[PDB]
Symmetry: none
Subunit: 282 residues, 2 copies
């Protein structure tokens, strides 16, 4: 009595990202009936492990608890003991959405050009991928790239850009990245110049700058009041987010001339001078 063995490989009916629905194609078989038990054997390809299995009452079965984008192999055994496995079916599960690229940075390269960069990407699957970049009013860049040049923009403009990673699935959008093109003109001077916490040795100085002019740096020049002074002091603040400063080491009962500048890709601003800093006796 020849042990029965299916004619056709199992058929995949519906595939998800975590589940596969299979028609095991038990019948028709070759050999002698009747059949008292049908077994579907399944296993992720290139995984060194024993085959998993379940008994199938009928013809249709759903494999749950699967992994994304994984290829699985399927075959069926029938019992009249156990016979030879039928033809093998291979299928791959579905892609899930990828999170946006890491270390996203949008930076000015010119007055008409922004550069968007991200960290190199290592997916959990061998999907072919590209990055979709959206300027918020679309350009598709090959996934082997980590930088995209956004051209033909206008000087002194503010742009918002987001990205996502596309395979077959569509990716999760990044949060917007806001950046400015470089300025075409000199920056405006610092504003709201107040001086507080005067001592005999020190004083606090604060200001605000206007956004939109690519102000990358701030110079605070101070100097003892005289028509005859051989020395002045330039403090150079290369991070234009700092908006206050403690002046220390001054001379008591002394009048100072304080000037505050702001610079960008074009040049410096006019002096935002302050009405006199005069330290206290002692």
């Amino acid at each position: 009595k020849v042990l029965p063995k299916p004619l056709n490989a199992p058929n995949v009916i519906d595939t998800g990202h975590n589940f596969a629905v299979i028609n095991i194609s038990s019948e028709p078989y070759f050999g002698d009936g009747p059949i008292k038990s049908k077994k579907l054997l399944y296993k992720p390809v290139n995984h060194y492990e024993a085959w998993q299995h379940i008994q199938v009452t009928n013809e249709i079965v759903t494999l749950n608890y699967l992994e994304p984008r994984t290829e699985y192999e399927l075959c069926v055994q029938l019992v009249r003991g156990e016979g030879h496995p039928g033809p093998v079916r291979r299928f791959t599960t579905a892609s899930i959405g990828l999170p946006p690229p890491r270390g996203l940075n949008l930076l000015p390269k010119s007055q008409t050009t922004l550069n968007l960069t991200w960290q190199p990407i290592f997916p959990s699957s061998e999907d072919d991928f590209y990055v979709e970049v959206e300027r918020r009013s679309n350009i598709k860049v090959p996934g082997n790239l980590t930088s995209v040049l956004l051209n033909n923009l206008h000087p002194r403009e503010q742009y918002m850009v987001r990205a996502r990673v596309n395979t077959k699935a569509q990716g999760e959008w990044s949060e917007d990245l806001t950046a400015w093109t470089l300025s075409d003109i000199l920056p405006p001077q610092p504003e709201n110049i107040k001086i507080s916490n005067i001592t005999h040795s020190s004083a606090m100085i604060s200001w605000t700058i206007l956004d939109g002019y690519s102000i990358s740096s701030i110079t605070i020049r101070y100097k003892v009041q005289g028509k005859n002074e051989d020395q002045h002091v330039d403090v150079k603040i290369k991070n234009a987010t700092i908006t206050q400063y403690q002046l220390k080491g001054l001379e008591p009962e002394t009048a100072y001339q304080v000037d505050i500048f702001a610079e960008n890709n074009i040049g410096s601003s006019n002096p935002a001078f302050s009405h006199e800093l005069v330290t206290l006796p002692e």
Copy 2:
């Protein structure tokens, strides 16, 4: 003894706006000398009043206390050593102009992305010189200065050929041959060519059960003329409220009359000549309970 009278008119040799230097031209004369005293008579033309007079010891006198751009007439009388003779020929001269004050009601207003219009009240000067208006356009750093002269019968000058979203300093003065006083600088922005950035630095503080204080920052230079604060109860909704602020210098706002223990969706917009900005959202408006 035929009474002595000068033959030439006095000569004006220097001229200011408040003074005149005169050679009285006493000699040569007609008649019989010698000369005991010389007298220069002078008067503002078209002034119904008596002639003023000054004694001149020698030949050169300096008339002070004069008025700007005023026509005067001069003549000289002589006394001999042994009364007063005929006045000599008359010399007319006009004093010099002083610098006029700047135009009044000065106003600089943006008309387009590339045009500013400068206006002023019609000018009625204290003299009758042919005058003009000089308009000086500079940048904030006083870079590309452009001077334009406009005929004095005009009250408006269009300063086109500029650039969108830029600031310009404009001052004016009224000139004759005497240069006028420069007016105070007027600064104005050209109209935007693009939509305004959304307001930023949005802060919601002083939360109560009834209110809150919304602060924000907008960017100068985009010709932003209005601010819209739109808030609804978080939920579709059958109603919402639009606070409309026409003074774009207001950066705070006190929302009042708010239901206790409730969540609001607050959006803030910026409006200019091109249109409206993207909304500046905040889900952060959640009041405190009646307690």
